[PDB]
Amino acid sequence: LSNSDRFSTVPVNRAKVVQHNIKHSFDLKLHLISLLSLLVIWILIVAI
């Protein structure tokens, strides 16, 4: 009962908690990074 207020009387949808955590989190833009890297490599070798 020390941490009784730590628990929830109502049920908790923990899947939605994890989904909001994923939604509002830093986006490692590997798509942009990969496109930029390929463009850099092509410019450095083929173009220049």
């Binding site: 628990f7 929830s8 009387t9 109502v10 049920p11 908790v12 949808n13 923990r14």
Partner: protein
């Protein structure tokens, strides 16, 4: 994963009673009908006096 969602707002008496002896149980009474019973006796109604 984890554990199933639990709604405290709906009270279940069986959660608090951890001993079978203390739970109220409907059982067959050979004398007449069926009666409630437990280690605390039979559920009863108040008489006149």
């Amino acid at each position: 994963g984890g554990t199933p969602a639990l709604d405290r707002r709906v009270q279940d008496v069986n959660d608090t009673i951890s001993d079978v002896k203390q739970k109220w149980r409907c059982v067959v009474y050979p004398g007449n009908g069926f009666v409630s019973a437990s280690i605390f006796g039979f559920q009863a109604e108040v008489g006149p006096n």
